Amino acid sequence: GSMPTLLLTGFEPFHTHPDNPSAQAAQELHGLELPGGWGVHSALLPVEPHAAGAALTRLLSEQDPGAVLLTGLAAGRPQVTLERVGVGVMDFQIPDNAGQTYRDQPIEPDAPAAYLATLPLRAILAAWREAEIPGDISNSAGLYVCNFVLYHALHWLREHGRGAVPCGFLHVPANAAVALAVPADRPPLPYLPQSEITRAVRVAAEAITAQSS
Amino acid sequence: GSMPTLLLTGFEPFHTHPDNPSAQAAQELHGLELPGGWGVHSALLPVEPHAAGAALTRLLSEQDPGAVLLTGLAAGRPQVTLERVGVGVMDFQIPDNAGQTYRDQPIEPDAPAAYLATLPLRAILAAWREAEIPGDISNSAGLYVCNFVLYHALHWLREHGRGAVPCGFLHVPANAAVALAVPADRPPLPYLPQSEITRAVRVAAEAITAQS
Amino acid sequence: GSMPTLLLTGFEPFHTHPDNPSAQAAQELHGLELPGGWGVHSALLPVEPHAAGAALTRLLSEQDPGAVLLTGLAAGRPQVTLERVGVGVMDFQIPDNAGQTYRDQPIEPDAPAAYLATLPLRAILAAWREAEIPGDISNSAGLYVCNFVLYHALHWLREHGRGAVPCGFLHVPANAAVALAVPADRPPLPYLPQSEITRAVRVAAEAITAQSS
Amino acid sequence: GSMPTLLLTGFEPFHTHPDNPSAQAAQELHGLELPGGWGVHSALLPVEPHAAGAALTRLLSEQDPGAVLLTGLAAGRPQVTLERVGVGVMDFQIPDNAGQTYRDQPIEPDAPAAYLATLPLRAILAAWREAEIPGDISNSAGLYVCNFVLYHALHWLREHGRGAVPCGFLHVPANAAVALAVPADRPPLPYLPQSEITRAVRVAAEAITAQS
Ligand SMILES: O=C1CC[C@@H](C(=O)O)N1
Ligand SMILES: O=C1CC[C@@H](C(=O)O)N1
Ligand SMILES: O=C1CC[C@@H](C(=O)O)N1
Ligand SMILES: O=C1CC[C@@H](C(=O)O)N1
Ligand code: NA
Ligand code: NA
Ligand code: NA
Ligand code: NA
After folding, report:
1. How far is it, in rounded angstroms, from Cα C3 to Cα C33?
2. What secondary structure does DSSP assign to B165-191, as a single string?
3. Which of A208, C100, D94, D121 is deepest in the core (most CB within 10 A)?
4. Which domain holds residue A19?
5. CA triplet B82, B86, B89: central angle to 5 degrees?
6. Which molecular-function annotations from GO does this UniProt entry contain (chains A, C)?
7. Rounded to an integer, what distance in angstroms lies between the CA atom of residue B5 and that of residue B209?
């Protein structure tokens, strides 16, 4: 679509969480103009793998993005993290938003066990540090719906001759709304104000598109 | 002075931390006018109990506060917390800023084993929640310098007939500067942006003076 | 009762836990003969403060022990711990076994805010280390029923002219039974086999009675 | 040899740890006779990927095992865990025993991003539970030397037409010796007595050969 597009996704609330900070960040950053003619196109995905995969395939096909930043909540993690690897297995510790679970389930017959993310991981960490944002690389995204869409996107891009499109996953901590809903019988969550989370996603987006030059 | 004063303290950096969010919050809020004629008076304490006690005694005497909010860093905690109890023992897991440690050391011979904080704990929790700030009561402040000054202030106030002056401790998480300095071989810290920490201290101060 | 008695207590199961390792250890060590003519007398307490206090008062009065070792479960702690202080407040994050809760409730009108434990803390830590048992001092026992009985016993002993009787609290990790019952949606617990927990309680008992000489 | 062999490996001490429970477990279980004519063959690998890979290749070739159980220390984890996946990257947060680190380094150019472990994971979990041993599957082995040898063995087996040989990784908690050496300024480690760790490794080995 003429100018380069960064596809930015977040997820809906799920489980006992009343809010999803990845949804809030995607909503706030939609349409952001970045240097070099780049623009952010945001979308929200459902927390259910069949529908999330179908929606993500449509976005990848219709938007033909120059880079892909998938985001989601990791309640309990203290700092933003970049996923190194998407694994081709579905194994759900809690049900998805259709009440569904999967046990040791391969995502795709006759496909790789995993895909490495193709984002410029160290450049993003450096941009975060320069912006005074603590963060790190994670080497497991879980085997729930965030991992599923990471594997799904990397596989689709490779199969469509677009393996050079940088693509990865950014997990964010709880925001205040998520932390406030935790029951009194449970341990408190690390959290970040939503404005810090959104800024972290923005800084990652800016670093990704700066590198594609 | 003639108007009611909330005494607000923070601590200097210590150990491997290059910044102390409690220092930053106290500095930002000094002079804040609160409803009912209350004003915040801030001070920065050293992380060493002899000098901290001497400085805090001078503040309690000279500033004559109507309420006392002592604050400090609790690196590793995810949310602001209010200390329920100050224990009369110094036992240091790391040295203080004079390089000193204490082992099982009573703070004052012949004094109580502990003092309960006299801040309106549930009112502060409720004010935090209304401001969308997660937080809770803590039942141990450690036995390092933050606990020391909590015990010291509660004891001084009671010994001077001022036990009715609400007094307590507010531990804050790491800010970004504290979290960014953690070595690569160590676990990452929960943290909050400084503006969130300062706002939590402000909301607590406002709840304390509203109750008084 | 002629020879010196160490009073050893544990607690019944509570909450979602099917077993209490402090009960198991107290049961196994009842009647143990220790050097110097000392013998262990064990009892189990209910997880409910009114009945636990009444039972503990009867034990302190009827057994007239030379030392008191109160034990209980701290599910989530990795290593045995010795409580430094019992605080005169009841504040329950979960109900007790009568379904009861207390909020910011003073244990006793016109009594101290707290009592320091009078066990030989460093001698116990050293005995544990010599026995290759990791452990440490804890500076909060919580404000649930274990803290309640620690405060209760120290207060009773002081009020009855028996403040010199060494008295304290030993919190133990989950055993295997406790860890196996954790739901799949919850984080795993640190645990120790029951034989390690019982041995830790035994080593503490031996150090306490050795010091009373 | 003529009878089926389960190859069991552990690692030497590394970093600040004076002992490695995986070494102790492998040493105790060497030669264990299991039902069906199976026997355990143990070996101790160095915590350095070049020498560990060379030693493991020699073991896979010379011992010709019917199953492979690689074990190692995961200091901080509370319960035994089975690794689901070995990732083709070396990225070291602490140096190895040669003082070396690797940053984002592919293990082998032109090889898969990962290999899934081929042990009967659910059967092992069920055997642990029947033996009253808490445990679970882990979805990251780290990117240090334990992950390296998991990837190395799965790749070697597949490249030699032996992908059907069940092969995986079992991380164990600290034992008492590891936990006792932690400095006073650091958080305490979950741990298990060595006899509990060794029993967990034994129960896993028995479940693996029962399935084969
Ligand atoms: O935001 C989300 C949606 C699913 C979940 C995950 O990490 O898989 N976090
Ligand atoms: O800010 C501070 C100074 C000392 C330390 C403590 O909690 O004791 N935190
Ligand atoms: O064993 C027990 C009974 C009550 C609980 C506690 O720590 O208070 N642990
Ligand atoms: O026992 C060991 C050797 C290396 C380390 C690891 O998990 O990679 N644990
Ligand atoms: Na005044
Ligand atoms: Na100590
Ligand atoms: Na053979
Ligand atoms: Na790294």
Report:
1. 11
2. S-EEEEEE-B-HHHHHTS-TTSPPPPB
3. A208
4. 1-213
5. 145
6. pyroglutamyl-peptidase activity
7. 9
Nearest ligand to residue D86 Cα = 4
Q: Give the tokens for residue A129.
A: 């540090």
Q: What is the CATH number of the domain that holds A181?
A: 3.40.630.20
- Classify the C-alpha dihedral D141-D143-D149-D151 as positive or negative: positive
Pairwise CA distance, residues C26 & C68, whole Å: 12
**Residue B15: CA atoms inside 13 Å, Cβ hemisphere, count?**
17
Distance CA B106, CA B111 (A): 9
In the chain, the amino acid numbered B68 is V
Alpha carbon distance, N-terminus to C-terminus of chain B: 17
Q: Residue C104 contacts by C-beta under 8 Å, 6 or more apart in sequence? A: B121, B122, C89, C91
Ligand 3 pocket mutation pick from C9, C20, C97, C144 by most atoms within 8 angstroms of CB: C144
Chains touching A (3+ CB pairs < 8 Å): B, C, D
- Helices then strands, counting H and E runs in chain C, come out as 6, 11
Q: Do D112 and A116 touch (CB under 8 A)?
A: no
Tokens 């999803």 locate to A20
- How far apart, in Å, are the Cα atoms of D117 and each of A110, A114, D60, D153? 17, 13, 16, 10
Contact A72, A10 (CB under 8 A): yes
Q: What are the Cα distances from residue B179, in Å, to A72, A123, B183? A: 22, 19, 9
The CA distance from A38 to D188, in Å, is 49
Q: What is the rounded CA–CA span in Å between residue B82 and residue D96? A: 43
Count structural domains, chain B.
Answer: 1
**Ligand 3 binding pocket includes C74 (Cβ within 6 Å):** yes
Structure tokens at A72: 């989601």
Which residues, 6+ apart, have CB-to-CB distance to D139 below 8 Å?
A87, A91, A140, A142, A143, D83, D84, D85
CA distance B163 to B87: 17
